[PDB]
From a paper:
To generalize this engineering approach for crystal contacts, a non-ADH-homologous enzyme was selected to apply the established strategies to the Nostoc sp. PCC 1720 ene reductase (NostocER). This oxidoreductase from the old yellow enzyme family (OYE, EC 1.6.99.1) catalyzes the trans-hydrogenations of activated alkenes, demonstrating its industrial relevance as a biocatalyst. As OYEs are strongly dependent on cost-intensive NADPH as a cofactor, Mähler et al. engineered NADH-accepting variants (NostocER1) by exchanging NostocER loop regions at cofactor-binding sites to ER loop regions from Achromobacter sp. JA81 and Acaryochloris marina with a higher NADH affinity. For this study, the NostocER1 Loop1,5 variant (NostocER1-L1,5) was selected as an example protein for the rational introduction of Lys–Glu interactions at crystal contacts to demonstrate the impact of rational single amino acid exchanges on the crystallizability of proteins and enhance protein crystallization.
The NspER1-L1,5 WT and mutants Q204K, Q350K, D352K, and T354K crystallized under the crystallization condition containing 10 g L−1 of purified protein and 150 g L−1 PEG 6000 in the crystallization buffer, whereby the crystal amount was highest, and the crystal size was smallest for mutant T354K, followed by Q204K and D352K. Mutants D352K and T354K crystallizing in the same space group P1211 as the wild type showed, again, an excellent agreement in crystal packing. The distance of 3.5 Å between the carboxy group of E27 and the amino group of mutant T354K indicates the formation of a salt bridge. Distances between the participating functional groups of salt bridges were defined to be ≤4 Å, which could be applied to T354K, explaining its enhanced crystallizability. Introducing a lysine at any of the neighboring NspER1-L1,5 positions Q350, (D352), and T354 led to an interaction with the intermolecular amino acid residue of E25/27. The neighboring NspER1-L1,5 mutants Q350K, D352K, and T354K led to an interaction with intermolecular E25/27 and an increase in crystallizability (Section 3.2, Section 3.3 and Section 3.4), with the strongest impact for T354K. This indicates that introducing electrostatic interactions is not limited to single positions but can also be applied to suitable neighboring amino acid residues, making the approach even more applicable.
Author numbering: 15 to 370
Write the structure that this text describes.
């Protein structure tokens, strides 16, 4: 087996092992609604074994950056259906990444100019982009215990909206220091209720969110993404091996589509070595594993052949190469990604990277 082998993901038949990683492109229109241009972008990439669409806020409070799309309104459902229809017409498969940014936001992006919510009242460091340029972060409000059901319900409604939008499945974003990750990691979570302290408490929001989403979706169409060794957004855990190893085992109850690991590119250089080898998680999580982070044809074939992972997601290379699968398959030159046009804007650096 290699990166071009087919794969059975529940009832979905993937033509290859190549996944398009979720990539925020900040190109939503008024009301954070997807539009035709976005449909073209994802349709261009439909040769992917599976596309995971960009992080998409499940509720207004879950937005943290200008012009990211939502999945909380009927108008957003309609705009996403343009996208899933195009991907389906092009013979592809697409899951929606369900987001809530938690503390990584600013009042200017929040309903009524209120505070971002979080497990604990810990201000991120530095500045955050608003509609009026960069502004200092404020301190988020720590959620009351009694409010956690409402967070879980916002994710359940986000998942239901994704189903109405015609996606093939959803991915729970539990990585990169956003809301669920903020609860996971003891650096961001110092709660003294059942959602803080012990690992089974820190993992509780993830597990409750997953349980609610599997009430809407068949479980084999629900994935979870973790990023055990990122330090993005000021979110770190003091015992990542035990924390993430626990989560990989706890998720098995749900019979999920997959577990997706973003392997931080800078982890070894920082952490002075390999704190959480992905093999540790591979051995604990009994389902499909997607791995991600600086993969190539050569690196992806190896992890598949070695049984270290089942699926390989590419982020950066999918920005710049719409036909990435084909290019990898024939060892074609790859287009170089232009960082200047990753976030915001229009067609330039989005739909105008050429096919082979
Ligand atoms: C422009 C850009 C936007 C990203 N947006 C997301 C996101 O929406 N959700 C997410 O989980 N990761 C996101 N990431 C992380 C990527 O999915 C991916 O894990 C990372 O870029 C490493 O993979 P790569 O080396 O193949 O690019 C983003 C990365 C980039 C470069
Ligand atoms: C939503 C998301 O995960 C994003 C990832 C990053 C990244 C990998 O560096 C980040 C956490 O800042 C880039 C863009 C966003 C939104
Ligand atoms: Cl196509
Ligand atoms: Na199914």
């Amino acid at each position: 087996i290699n990166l071009f082998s087919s794969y059975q993901l529940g009832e979905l038949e993937l033509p290859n092992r190549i996944v398009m990683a979720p990539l925020t492109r900040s190109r939503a229109g008024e009301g954070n609604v997807p539009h035709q241009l976005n449909a073209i972008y994802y349709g261009q990439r439909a040769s992917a074994g599976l596309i995971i669409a960009e992080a998409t806020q499940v509720t207004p409070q879950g937005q943290g950056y200008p012009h990211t799309p939502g999945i909380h309104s009927p108008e957003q459902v309609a705009g996403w259906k343009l996208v899933t229809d195009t991907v389906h017409q092009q013979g592809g498969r697409i899951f929606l990444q369900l987001w809530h940014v938690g503390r990584i936001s600013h009042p200017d992006l929040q309903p009524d100019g209120g505070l971002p919510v979080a497990p604990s009242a810990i201000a991120p460091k530095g500045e955050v982009l608003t509609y009026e340029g960069k502004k200092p972060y404020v301190t988020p409000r720590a959620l009351d215990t009694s409010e956690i059901p409402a967070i879980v319900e916002q994710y359940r409604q986000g998942a239901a909206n994704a189903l109405a939008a015609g996606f093939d499945g959803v991915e729970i974003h539990a990585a990169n220091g956003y809301l669920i990750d903020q609860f996971l990691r003891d650096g961001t979570n110092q709660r003294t209720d059942e959602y803080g302290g012990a690992i089974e408490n820190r993992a509780r929001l993830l597990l409750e969110v997953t349980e609610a989403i599997t009430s809407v979706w068949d479980s084999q169409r629900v994935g979870v993404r973790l990023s055990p060794l990122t330090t993005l957004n000021g979110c770190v855990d003091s015992h990542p091996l035990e924390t993430f190893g626990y989560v990989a085992q706890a998720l098995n109850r749900f019979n999920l589509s997959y577990l997706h690991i973003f392997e931080a590119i800078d982890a070894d250089i920082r952490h002075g070595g390999t704190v959480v080898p992905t093999s540790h998680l591979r051995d604990r999580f009994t389902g499909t594993l997607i791995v991600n982070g600086g993969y190539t044809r050569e690196k992806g074939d190896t992890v598949i052949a070695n049984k270290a992972a089942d699926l390989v997601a590419f982020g950066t290379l999918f920005i710049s190469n719409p036909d990435l699968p084909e290019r990898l398959e024939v060892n074609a030159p790859l287009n170089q990604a232009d960082p200047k046009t990753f976030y915001g804007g229009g067609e330039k650096g989005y739909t105008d990277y050429p096919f082979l």
